[PDB]
Amino acid sequence: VLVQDLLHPSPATEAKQHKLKTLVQQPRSFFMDVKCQGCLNITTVFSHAQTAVTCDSCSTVLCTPTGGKAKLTEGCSFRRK
């Protein structure tokens, strides 16, 4: 391809790129609002959390760290902020 719009890449191909290989690098991680099953208290949890986060109300682990994204425990619902 000799002629191509480098300043306006296709958003489809833009989403497949590595996070450092876009025009402006941008993280693919996010923050979530986590509902434990026991109660209803907003707890902000990083998507790629490295800590076994526990909510303040009840000492229940919300997520377990993995190689990539943290794994939410059963009965815990998240909503992306």
Partner 1 sequence: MENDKGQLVELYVPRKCSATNRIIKAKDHASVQISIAKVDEDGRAIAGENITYALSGYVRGRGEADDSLNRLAQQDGLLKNVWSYSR
Partner 2 sequence: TRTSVLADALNAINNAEKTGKRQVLIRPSSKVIIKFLTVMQKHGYIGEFEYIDDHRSGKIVVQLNGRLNKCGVIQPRFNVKINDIERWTDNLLPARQFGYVILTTSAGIMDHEEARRKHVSGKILGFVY
Partner RNA sequence: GAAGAUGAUCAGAUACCGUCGUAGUCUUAACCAUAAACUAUGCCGACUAGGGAUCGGUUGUUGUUCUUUUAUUGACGCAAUCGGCACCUUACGAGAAAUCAAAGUCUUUGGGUUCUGGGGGGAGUAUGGUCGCAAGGCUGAAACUUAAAGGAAUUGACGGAAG
Residues of this chain, 18-47, that bind RNA according to CB under 7 A: 18, 21
* Residue 3 or 56 having the CB closest to RNA: 3
Kindly calculate the radius of gyration of the chain based on its CA atoms and give it in whole angstroms.
18
Q: Is 76 annotated as a binding residue?
A: no
Q: Is 63 annotated as a binding residue?
A: no
CB of 24 to RNA, least distance (A): 15
Closest C-alpha among 73, 64, 79 to residue 37: 73
Q: Choosing among partner 1, RNA, partner 2, none, which partner's interface includes residue 8 (Cβ < 5 to 8 Å by kind)?
A: partner 1
* Residue found by looking up tokens 């992306």 in the block: 80
CB of 65 to Zn ion, least distance (A): 18
Q: How remote is the C-alpha of 46 from its chain's centroid?
A: 6
Does 5 contact RNA by CB under 7 A?
no
Helix (H, G, I), strand (E, B) or coil at 11: helix
